[PDB]
Enzyme design. Structure first.
Site, PDB file in Angstrom:
ATOM      1  N   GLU A   1      79.283  -8.926  14.987  1.00 36.18           N
ATOM      2  CA  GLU A   1      80.143  -7.931  14.351  1.00 36.18           C
ATOM      3  C   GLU A   1      80.310  -6.693  15.224  1.00 36.18           C
ATOM      4  O   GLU A   1      81.436  -6.233  15.437  1.00 36.18           O
ATOM      5  CB  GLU A   1      79.619  -7.557  12.963  1.00 36.18           C
ATOM      6  CG  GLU A   1      79.691  -8.704  11.967  1.00 36.18           C
ATOM      7  CD  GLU A   1      79.326  -8.300  10.554  1.00 36.18           C
ATOM      8  OE1 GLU A   1      78.952  -7.131  10.345  1.00 36.18           O
ATOM      9  OE2 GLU A   1      79.415  -9.154   9.647  1.00 36.18           O
TER      10      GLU A   1
ATOM     11  N   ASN B   1      67.207   8.154  32.504  1.00 39.90           N
ATOM     12  CA  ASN B   1      65.922   8.815  32.301  1.00 39.90           C
ATOM     13  C   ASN B   1      66.008  10.328  32.159  1.00 39.90           C
ATOM     14  O   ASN B   1      65.246  10.901  31.379  1.00 39.90           O
ATOM     15  CB  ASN B   1      64.970   8.469  33.448  1.00 39.90           C
ATOM     16  CG  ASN B   1      64.772   6.975  33.602  1.00 39.90           C
ATOM     17  OD1 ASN B   1      64.144   6.333  32.761  1.00 39.90           O
ATOM     18  ND2 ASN B   1      65.316   6.411  34.674  1.00 39.90           N
TER      19      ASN B   1
ATOM     20  N   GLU C   1      55.889  -9.911  40.043  1.00 43.91           N
ATOM     21  CA  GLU C   1      54.524  -9.533  40.350  1.00 43.91           C
ATOM     22  C   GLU C   1      53.703  -9.517  39.067  1.00 43.91           C
ATOM     23  O   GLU C   1      54.222  -9.155  38.005  1.00 43.91           O
ATOM     24  CB  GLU C   1      54.455  -8.153  41.020  1.00 43.91           C
ATOM     25  CG  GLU C   1      55.222  -7.065  40.291  1.00 43.91           C
ATOM     26  CD  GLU C   1      55.031  -5.701  40.916  1.00 43.91           C
ATOM     27  OE1 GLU C   1      54.166  -5.571  41.808  1.00 43.91           O
ATOM     28  OE2 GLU C   1      55.747  -4.760  40.515  1.00 43.91           O
TER      29      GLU C   1
ATOM     30  N   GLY D   1      61.721  -7.533  34.732  1.00 40.63           N
ATOM     31  CA  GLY D   1      61.347  -6.408  35.560  1.00 40.63           C
ATOM     32  C   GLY D   1      60.224  -5.586  34.956  1.00 40.63           C
ATOM     33  O   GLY D   1      59.782  -5.797  33.824  1.00 40.63           O
ATOM     34  N   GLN D   2      59.751  -4.625  35.753  1.00 44.05           N
ATOM     35  CA  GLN D   2      58.684  -3.738  35.302  1.00 44.05           C
ATOM     36  C   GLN D   2      59.160  -2.849  34.159  1.00 44.05           C
ATOM     37  O   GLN D   2      58.410  -2.594  33.206  1.00 44.05           O
ATOM     38  CB  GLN D   2      58.181  -2.904  36.476  1.00 44.05           C
ATOM     39  CG  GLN D   2      56.777  -2.368  36.323  1.00 44.05           C
ATOM     40  CD  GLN D   2      56.752  -0.890  36.038  1.00 44.05           C
ATOM     41  OE1 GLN D   2      57.772  -0.215  36.135  1.00 44.05           O
ATOM     42  NE2 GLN D   2      55.581  -0.370  35.707  1.00 44.05           N
TER      43      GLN D   2
ATOM     44  N   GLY E   1      66.086  -1.975  40.384  1.00 40.37           N
ATOM     45  CA  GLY E   1      65.039  -2.831  40.899  1.00 40.37           C
ATOM     46  C   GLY E   1      65.581  -4.132  41.459  1.00 40.37           C
ATOM     47  O   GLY E   1      66.605  -4.642  41.008  1.00 40.37           O
ATOM     48  N   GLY E   2      64.869  -4.666  42.455  1.00 42.47           N
ATOM     49  CA  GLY E   2      65.294  -5.913  43.073  1.00 42.47           C
ATOM     50  C   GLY E   2      65.246  -7.086  42.113  1.00 42.47           C
ATOM     51  O   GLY E   2      66.198  -7.866  42.020  1.00 42.47           O
TER      52      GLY E   2
ATOM     53  N   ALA F   1      60.146  -8.631  44.394  1.00 38.34           N
ATOM     54  CA  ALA F   1      61.414  -8.613  45.110  1.00 38.34           C
ATOM     55  C   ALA F   1      61.498  -7.499  46.141  1.00 38.34           C
ATOM     56  O   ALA F   1      62.398  -7.539  46.988  1.00 38.34           O
ATOM     57  CB  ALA F   1      62.575  -8.486  44.124  1.00 38.34           C
TER      58      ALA F   1
HETATM   59  N1  LIG Z   1      62.779   4.101  30.808  1.00 40.98           N
HETATM   60  C1  LIG Z   1      61.919   3.412  31.550  1.00 40.98           C
HETATM   61  N2  LIG Z   1      62.270   3.022  32.826  1.00 40.98           N
HETATM   62  C2  LIG Z   1      61.402   2.320  33.591  1.00 40.98           C
HETATM   63  C3  LIG Z   1      60.153   1.991  33.089  1.00 40.98           C
HETATM   64  N3  LIG Z   1      59.491   1.300  34.037  1.00 40.98           N
HETATM   65  C4  LIG Z   1      60.288   1.186  35.120  1.00 40.98           C
HETATM   66  N4  LIG Z   1      61.471   1.820  34.869  1.00 40.98           N
HETATM   67  C5  LIG Z   1      62.606   1.893  35.806  1.00 40.98           C
HETATM   68  O1  LIG Z   1      62.440   0.907  36.809  1.00 40.98           O
HETATM   69  C6  LIG Z   1      62.761   1.428  38.080  1.00 40.98           C
HETATM   70  C7  LIG Z   1      61.912   0.789  39.173  1.00 40.98           C
HETATM   71  O2  LIG Z   1      62.062  -0.613  39.196  1.00 40.98           O
HETATM   72  P1  LIG Z   1      60.908  -1.538  38.572  1.00 40.98           P
HETATM   73  O3  LIG Z   1      61.278  -1.989  37.182  1.00 40.98           O
HETATM   74  O4  LIG Z   1      59.613  -0.768  38.571  1.00 40.98           O
HETATM   75  O5  LIG Z   1      60.748  -2.796  39.562  1.00 40.98           O
HETATM   76  P2  LIG Z   1      61.712  -4.079  39.489  1.00 40.98           P
HETATM   77  O6  LIG Z   1      62.919  -3.818  38.622  1.00 40.98           O
HETATM   78  O7  LIG Z   1      60.921  -5.261  38.985  1.00 40.98           O
HETATM   79  O8  LIG Z   1      62.141  -4.332  41.019  1.00 40.98           O
HETATM   80  P3  LIG Z   1      61.056  -4.841  42.093  1.00 40.98           P
HETATM   81  O9  LIG Z   1      59.832  -3.963  42.051  1.00 40.98           O
HETATM   82  O10 LIG Z   1      61.656  -4.813  43.475  1.00 40.98           O
HETATM   83  O11 LIG Z   1      60.668  -6.255  41.740  1.00 40.98           O
HETATM   84  C8  LIG Z   1      62.514   2.920  37.981  1.00 40.98           C
HETATM   85  O12 LIG Z   1      63.499   3.621  38.697  1.00 40.98           O
HETATM   86  C9  LIG Z   1      62.629   3.237  36.510  1.00 40.98           C
HETATM   87  O13 LIG Z   1      63.854   3.885  36.268  1.00 40.98           O
HETATM   88  C10 LIG Z   1      59.795   2.379  31.807  1.00 40.98           C
HETATM   89  O14 LIG Z   1      58.689   2.089  31.359  1.00 40.98           O
HETATM   90  N5  LIG Z   1      60.684   3.092  31.037  1.00 40.98           N
HETATM   91 MG   LIG Z   2      59.298  -5.492  40.374  1.00 41.41          MG
END
Ligand SMILES: Nc1nc2c(ncn2[C@@H]2O[C@H](COP(=O)(O)OP(=O)(O)OP(=O)(O)O)[C@@H](O)[C@H]2O)c(=O)[nH]1
Ligand SMILES: [Mg+2]
Ligand SMILES: Nc1nc2c(ncn2[C@@H]2O[C@H](COP(=O)(O)OP(=O)(O)O)[C@@H](O)[C@H]2O)c(=O)[nH]1
Lengths: 277, 431, 40, 371, 426, 50
Positions: free
Chosen positions: B246, B198, B63, B10-11, B135-136, B91
């Protein structure tokens, strides 16, 4: 809960002061009995790194008894990915554990290659006859000679040596035949110089070897040439050095690779400290 | 020799792995080129014949928008070309797209890369999975990856670094559906699950760290510091070293409960540690305060079950034991009656390192506290309430049903977490 | 001063957050310890 | 009217480089400081007596409230226009033929007003000497000139003044000794020159040439420059104090040492830190009456370190320096260096090593470890 | 990677597309010649999304331009940015539509779609992975409402999976510029609610209101009205082409904004607006963007949100910024305005972050909003349509060309059912 | 390495003690010599008793 350190009269300070006083007493009694580690290893590095002069060739021919240096040339190597550059020189090297523990040099001592051009106490070699009492005579191709190194010590003379490999005595990294330094006099100390070109080797056998030229060094009891490896490094107290073995390397044309080439570098006539190169 | 495989999905996974592998490179002195200027690095950095180190991590995203930033930025030359796996379409915040249609085509490539990286591991400790619930991709792809990994690799350790939704704010609308549907799946096929959010890190970085305008990089650097303090026992030498097995053994009593909370001390700037004394007692009473935990939940409502403390730096076990005895004497911390001995300790010698341009000060000692508590059932009950209040009117259901699942998955996903809530109160009942 | 833009035509913007943060992490004012040179 | 300078300080308790803004009002000599990264005041407008306008130039360490600040750049266009256009820079080079004549040259420089910032005595080897002789590749007398450079030690000095290049060229005069003697009378080359090859001095002619000579002798990048001529045998240590350097009696000190007959084998300039001052004077800590005052007088400004080779011509260097107190020296031994160049007990303008057995450690702290 | 195929029809759609293809020619630094004149390297990494590569380093848009009258092609091809559009992408007939939906949907638009479908299917297969479609037209006209909603049905039966997005010009009561316009507006709504995934309703009166009190323009011509619209399309797809912290493509917006398949009617807003004399004094800050974004006078639709209830709200941010201020400002407007949001969907707000702000600006935010109060717009059309249909006015232009009256009696039934569908969830 | 650092620190400590012990005697001897030389001419060092 507060802590202050070694000056403030707070909490438990007297016992810490007593620790400092007893440590001072222990240091003083070790000083009196001379077991301090700072007094041991002064003279060995000084004698190993003291400067030396090199001989001057009148006619450019390698003569017996002259002070020479062993220098491996620089050549770009395709087969090695990470390897040292520049002209290398062959130098003696004791083990670092022995250097820390024993002040006297031990037998045997290893050999290595260091990027150094000025002569020091680690790499000045004297070319000596096998039947001795020969000075000022031309060293010819395909002859026996010994490479004696004083090592900065006037008392002892050490000879390059290498024996046939066993399952117990081999090199540190490549596990090939290895070369060491022992003071014993035998036939394993004799080395033989030859021309690199195989077609002209038998024609040039018996001619005086010129100074500062590419030659190959072959042990007579093995016919494995002295070689320097650049892709395997030895980490010692003096730093990072290159491995030196006794092995013959031949390419697809069956000529000797640039690992085997060596020069007997002599000194400059104007300045004794500077070499001919 | 002992080494673990990092999987970021994921992102959130990618933008945490950036600031995590930055800290790994700085700790081992690894250049952004990939070469060390000159075996503890072998836990994360595999050698090559040219003296070049490459990491044991897999970045996955559907992506390429952030993976291209990874491939373009400062650390382009370091990561492998095949250790960063991308899809063409995201997703789109959908568990169905993440689990059945879009997340089904690249799982073969991901599994092949995992197998190729695991073949070179002489002794493998386990997998650490960095992902987000909301996230998806980070829900569906992580669920199916957990399934296939549990089928293929039998008894390896599985640790989770999971970004849980904050109780007040969030970044999505359908994140209760995503959270419910992936927490129904990852319960059986996971070993331990460290949970973060967060808002708690926002409050920490505002109150303790003294910047009023934080950023995801400021969050991710603290998360990377916590992960490094977790794996510091495997990486370096100390008096008492902990292992993945452990603190998997030493933190969860039952197979249905694998949810600790993570806390880190001390968090402070370069201005204030100049004056404040950083002692073992103060850094261990920082963790037990409710204002310093990184999950928005109050442990005074619940009862502790197990605790694992990791200490790094100039630390002495005598003061560690005295501070633990003071904690046990102090009353406001409650423990369940069936665990009279609740503490694990691990000791490491090296003090933490700081990053140039960083925010935390250069400290001498630090502690990370991983504690199982029953006070996560409160947040889970709030999320279940939100799920019911959304599902009552059948909103956002056509997106899920038109991409592969049926409608009974929602019912099963709610009923199993209701049963887990019942098990939470059953464990919390005193004997 | 129709407008052709919705502002005053500034251009400080052509950089990205991750790249710029990692650039400052790589290059900044270098701080290293300067150990005092002892007598012995 | 105020002048702004950004300054850098290394914080020893945390090991960070911190940049502040130091603002100087010269109408009352008052200083103020602000923080750059935090945007808050650091120090009120306080009348600080020790800091003067002559100590404000780039590359100078000024001690403000026991913090050493290294001025790195101009604060704004106003202070740039007011100071950078006026203050100019040049390099003075003293050839090996006039090492024994260096004291008079330095003293005439100090009358001329050229402020010395860095001073060093060094020996060039062949590589950096050939790098020095790049413009002279037309070979008029190239081998003789390169030999004349490589025979003996040279002296390199950095000197600041307005119209520095023009004034230094006016003082030097024509390069040829006889031509200089006919054209001018008070030229340095005409007064202390032998022939054209041995002109006893040198200087650049253009700004790019001066910058190249700077990067050649004194590397600001971080690489080590040419070494000194410290022999480390049968020698003692001497210190010319910041107040003596700022007053300008360094040339008179060198001339008096030469007239006594002691040989200075090496000398250079330091701008030491207080940690080094305390590590140097921990032996005097607790055994003398005034410790803190001596420490402050040591780290207040630039120090000159000399290795005095004892030729035992007349007596010990300590006996030549005389009593520590200037009034005791003036009443008992009126021919001594402290009796000539000392005003109070704290600032005696010459420091000499007290214990004869400590000469090797005294020279090795300055010219081996601090080198 | 994810290519957006722009469509425009009618006179209004052609003039908006002339201004929309101008601002992303400015954002990607593309000159009116067709080459690239930019300074950064972030502009070229995602340029295949909107521009097709050709020989000589020339980038041409992936857009089609359709109208039944050749009058409006001459102004487009002779405009400031007229040489960039491909000559094969102008599809024109000889007979105008003339404010009749039947001419655009049954007689003159019947044979013109076959030439457009050849052009569209060529550009559809030219994409490596087609993201979806986008359209801009007018409901009050003949070509835009006639042929444009005929194409919407014809594209949807070809690629069902791709997302469809619509930027509509809904009518106005007081700024009315057409007599027979409730007929053309009503009959196109049926063809919208079945074949569209996102609808952005832009109305003509609200744009004149914004340019009078906020930008303080004296003579707000169509070049000023189209430019505020032209900023909206750039601000909604800004994460499909630029790096950021929290990306949100077109499928990301439809998932959050649309809970039910017939709730796909939005109302848009653009946050940073201020006049030239007020630019240097007002400090543009994240609280200032938040306060201006939710205002009732700020919106681009003729509906008052105070008379309705927000179902779901989206916000896409641009520029360099922090997130803590964004998280608490969206939370503060959700806590204080608790009566302005429904209580059956928690967390009505969706946030997205980009890195690159629009050119000439430093921080920006685009507002997309699903609101219940859109049915106020559709009731005004429905009450006008009944007043015309009860007297059978203007019907001989419709039933006299090949159209039954049942399409009139059914289009009022669907519009009545939708406005009663919004009213339940209020 | 650390053992060598410890031994060097202890050696520096003892060297400081020896150097202070010698410097005390040197300063006292020179003070006595200066006092006698001043008393030769007729002036004396000042010490107060009030
Ligand atoms: N702590 C932290 N949380 C993050 C960060 N980047 C994204 N998130 C979390 O990721 C959530 C959004 O989902 P994404 O990770 O951006 O996208 P995804 O999980 O790949 O899901 P899709 O976009 O549908 O493919 C946000 O609500 C954030 O809480 C980061 O750099 N640090
Ligand atoms: Mg994504
Ligand atoms: N905002 C805006 N509205 C426009 C523009 N061009 C036309 N219109 C509106 O569109 C309506 C007429 O549309 P029309 O030309 O009949 O549509 P067509 O028949 O499909 O081409 C008028 O009421 C105008 O207010 C434009 O560039 N901007």
């Amino acid at each position: 809960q507060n802590v202050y350190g070694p000056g403030v009269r707070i909490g438990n300070w007297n016992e810490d002061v007593y620790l400092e006083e007893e440590l001072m007493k222990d240091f003083l009694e070790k000083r009196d009995k001379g077991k301090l580690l700072i007094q041991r290893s002064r003279r060995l590095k000084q004698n190993l790194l003291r400067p030396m002069q090199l001989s001057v060739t009148e006619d450019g021919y390698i003569h017996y008894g002259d002070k020479v240096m062993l220098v491996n040339p620089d050549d770009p190597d395709t087969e090695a990915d990470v390897f040292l550059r520049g002209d290398l020189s062959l130098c003696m090297t004791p083990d670092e554990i022995q250097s820390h523990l024993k002040d006297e040099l031990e037998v045997p001592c290893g050999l290595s290659a260091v990027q150094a051009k000025t002569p020091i106490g680690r790499n000045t070699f004297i070319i000596l006859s096998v039947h001795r009492d020969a000075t000022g005579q031309v060293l010819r191709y395909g002859q026996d000679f010994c490479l004696g190194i004083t090592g900065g010590f006037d008392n002892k003379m050490l000879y390059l040596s290498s024996d046939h490999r066993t399952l117990l005595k081999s090199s540190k990294r490549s596990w090939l035949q290895e070369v060491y330094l022992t003071d014993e006099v035998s036939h394993v100390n004799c080395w033989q110089a030859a021309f690199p070109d195989p077609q002209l080797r038998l024609e040039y056998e018996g001619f005086p070897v010129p100074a500062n030229a590419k030659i190959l060094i072959n042990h007579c009891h093995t016919n494995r040439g002295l070689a320097a490896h650049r892709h395997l490094f030895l980490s010692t107290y003096f730093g990072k050095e290159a491995e030196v073995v006794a092995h013959t390397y031949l390419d697809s044309h069956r000529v000797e690779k640039p690992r085997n080439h060596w020069m007997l570098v002599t000194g400059n006539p104007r300045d004794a400290s500077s070499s001919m190169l | 020799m002992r080494e673990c495989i990092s999987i970021h999905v994921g992102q959130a996974g990618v933008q945490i792995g950036n600031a995590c592998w930055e800290l790994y490179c700085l700790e081992h002195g690894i250049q952004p080129d990939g070469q060390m200027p000159s075996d503890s690095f072998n836990t994360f950095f595999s050698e090559t014949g040219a003296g070049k180190h490459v990491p044991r991590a897999v970045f996955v995203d559907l992506e390429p928008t952030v993976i291209d930033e990874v491939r373009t930025g400062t650390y382009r030359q370091l990561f492998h070309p095949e250790q960063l796996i991308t899809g063409k379409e995201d997703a789109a915040n959908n568990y169905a797209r993440g689990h059945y249609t879009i997340g089904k085509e690249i799982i073969d490539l991901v599994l092949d890369r995992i197998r190729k990286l695991a073949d070179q591991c002489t002794g493998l400790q386990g997998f650490l999975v960095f992902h987000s619930f909301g996230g998806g991709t980070g829900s569906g792809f992580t669920s199916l990856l957990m399934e296939r990994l549990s089928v293929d690799y039998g008894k390896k350790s599985k640790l989770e670094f999971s970004i849980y939704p904050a109780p007040q704010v969030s970044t999505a609308v359908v994140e209760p559906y995503n959270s419910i549907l992936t927490t129904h799946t990852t319960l059986e096929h996971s070993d331990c699950a460290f949970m973060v959010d967060n808002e708690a890190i926002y409050d920490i970085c505002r109150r303790n760290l003294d910047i009023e305008r934080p950023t995801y990089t400021n969050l991710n650097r603290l998360i990377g510091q916590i992960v490094s303090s977790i794996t510091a026992s495997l990486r370096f030498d100390g008096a008492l070293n902990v292992d993945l097995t452990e603190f998997q053994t030493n933190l969860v009593p039952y197979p249905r409960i694998h949810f600790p909370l993570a806390t880190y001390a001390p968090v402070i700037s370069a201005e204030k540690a100049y004056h404040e004394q950083l002692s073992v007692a103060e850094i261990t009473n920082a963790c037990f305060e409710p204002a310093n935990q990184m999950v928005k939940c109050d442990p005074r409502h619940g009862k502790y079950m197990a605790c694992c403390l990791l200490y790094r730096g100039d630390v002495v076990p005598k003061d560690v034991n005295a501070a633990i005895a003071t904690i046990k004497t102090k009353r406001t911390i409650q423990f369940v009656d069936w665990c009279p001995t609740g503490f694990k300790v691990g000791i490491n010698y090296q003090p933490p390192t700081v990053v140039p341009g960083g925010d935390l000060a250069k400290v001498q000692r630090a502690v990370c506290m991983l504690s199982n508590t029953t006070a996560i059932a409160e947040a889970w009950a709030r999320l279940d309430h939100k799920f019911d209040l959304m599902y009552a009117k059948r909103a956002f259901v056509h997106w899920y049903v038109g991409e592969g699942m049926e409608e009974g998955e929602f019912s099963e996903a709610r009923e199993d977490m209701a049963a887990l809530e019942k098990d939470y109160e059953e464990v919390g009942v005193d004997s | 001063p129709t407008y052709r833009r919705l502002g005053t035509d500034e251009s400080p913007i052509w950089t990205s957050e991750t790249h710029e943060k990692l650039s400052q992490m790589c290059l900044n004012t270098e701080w290293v310890e300067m150990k005092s040179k002892a007598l012995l | 009217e105020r002048f702004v300078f950004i300054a850098e300080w290394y914080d020893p308790n945390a090991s960070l480089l911190r940049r502040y803004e130091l603002l100087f009002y010269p109408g009352d000599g008052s200083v103020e400081m602000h923080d750059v990264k935090n945007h808050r005041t650091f120090l009120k407008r306080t009348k600080y007596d020790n800091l003067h306008l002559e100590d404000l130039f780039i590359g100078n360490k000024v001690n403000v409230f026991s913090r050493q600040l290294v001025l790195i750049d101009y604060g704004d266009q106003y202070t740039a226009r007011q100071l950078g256009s006026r203050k100019e820079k040049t390099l003075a080079l003293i050839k090996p033929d006039a090492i024994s004549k260096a004291g008079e040259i330095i003293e005439i420089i100090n009358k001329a007003g050229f402020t010395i910032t860095k001073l060093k005595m060094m020996m060039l080897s062949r590589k950096e000497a050939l790098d020095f002789h790049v413009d002279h590749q037309s070979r008029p007398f190239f081998n003789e000139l390169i030999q004349f450079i490589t025979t003996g030690p040279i002296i390199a000095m950095e000197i600041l003044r307005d119209d520095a290049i023009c004034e230094w060229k006016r003082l030097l005069g024509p390069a040829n000794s006889g031509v200089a003697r006919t054209d001018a009378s008070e030229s340095i080359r005409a007064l202390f020159g032998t022939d054209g090859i041995r002109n006893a001095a040198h200087g650049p002619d253009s700004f790019a040439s001066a910058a190249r000579e700077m990067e050649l002798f004194f590397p600001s990048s971080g690489g080590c420059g040419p070494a000194n001529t410290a022999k480390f045998t049968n020698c003692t240590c001497c210190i010319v104090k910041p107040h003596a350097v700022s007053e300008g009696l360094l040339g008179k000190i060198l001339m008096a040492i030469r007239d006594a007959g002691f040989e200075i084998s090496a000398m250079q300039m330091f701008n030491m830190d207080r940690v080094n001052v305390e590590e140097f004077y921990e032996v005097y800590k607790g055994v003398v009456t005034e410790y803190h005052d001596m420490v402050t007088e040591m780290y207040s400004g630039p120090c000159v370190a000399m290795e005095i080779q004892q030729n035992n011509a007349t007596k010990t260097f300590r006996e030549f320096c005389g009593p520590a107190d200037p009034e005791i020296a003036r009443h008992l031994r009126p021919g001594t260096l402290r009796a000539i160049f000392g005003k109070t007990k704290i600032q005696n303008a010459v420091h000499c090593t007290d214990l004869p057995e400590d000469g090797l450690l005294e020279v090795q702290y300055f010219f081996k470890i601090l080198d | 990677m994810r290519e957006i195929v722009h469509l425009q029809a009618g006179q209004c759609g052609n003039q908006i597309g002339a201004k929309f293809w101008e601002v992303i020619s400015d954002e990607h630094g593309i000159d009116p010649t067709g080459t690239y004149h930019g300074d950064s390297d972030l502009q070229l990494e995602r340029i295949n999304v909107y521009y097709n590569e050709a020989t000589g380093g020339k980038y041409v848009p992936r857009a089609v331009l359709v109208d039944l009258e050749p009058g409006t092609m001459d102004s487009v091809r002779s405009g400031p940015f007229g040489q960039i559009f491909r000559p094969d992408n102008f599809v024109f007939g000889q007979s105008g539509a003339g404010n009749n939906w039947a001419k655009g949907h049954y007689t003159e638009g019947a044979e013109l779609v076959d030439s457009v479908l050849d052009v569209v299917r060529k550009e559809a297969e030219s994409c490596d992975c087609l993201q979806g479609f986008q359209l801009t037209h007018s409901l009050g006209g003949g070509t835009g409402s006639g042929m444009g909603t005929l194409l919407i049905s014809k594209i949807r039966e070809e690629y069902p999976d791709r997302i469809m997005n619509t930027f509509s010009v809904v009518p106005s009561p007081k700024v009315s510029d057409t007599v027979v316009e409730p007929y053309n507006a009503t009959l196109s709504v049926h063809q919208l609610v079945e074949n569209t995934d996102e609808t952005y309703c832009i109305d003509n009166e609200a744009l004149y209101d914004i340019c009078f009190r906020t930008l303080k323009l004296t003579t707000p011509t169509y070049g000023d009205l189209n430019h505020l619209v032209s900023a909206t399309m750039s601000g909604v797809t800004t994460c499909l082409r630029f790096p950021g912290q929290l990306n949100a493509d077109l499928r990301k917006l439809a998932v959050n904004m649309v809970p039910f398949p017939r709730l796909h009617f939005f109302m848009p807003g653009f946050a940073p607006l201020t006049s030239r004399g007020s630019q240097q004094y007002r400090a543009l800050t994240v609280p200032e963007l938040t306060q201006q974004m939710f205002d009732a006078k700020n919106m681009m639709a003729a509906c008052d949100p105070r008379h309705g209830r927000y179902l779901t709200v989206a916000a896409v941010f641009r520029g360099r910024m922090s997130m803590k201020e964004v998280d608490e400002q969206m939370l503060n407007v959700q806590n204080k305005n608790s009566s302005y949001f429904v209580e059956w969907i928690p967390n009505n707000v969706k946030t997205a972050v980009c890195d690159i702000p629009p050119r000439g600006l430093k921080m920006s935010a685009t507002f997309i909003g699903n609101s219940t109060a859109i049915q106020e717009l559709f009731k005004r059309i429905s009450e006008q349509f009944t007043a015309m249909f009860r007297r059978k006015a203007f019907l001989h232009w419709y039933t006299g060309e090949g159209m039954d009256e049942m399409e009139f009696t059914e289009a009022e039934s669907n519009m009545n059912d939708l406005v009663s569908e919004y009213q339940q969830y209020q | 390495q650390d053992t060598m650092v410890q031994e060097l620190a202890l050696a520096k400590k003892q060297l400081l003690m020896v150097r202070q012990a010698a410097l005390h005697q040197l300063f006292e001897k020179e003070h006595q010599q200066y006092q006698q030389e001043l008393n030769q001419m007729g002036k004396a060092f000042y010490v107060e008793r009030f």
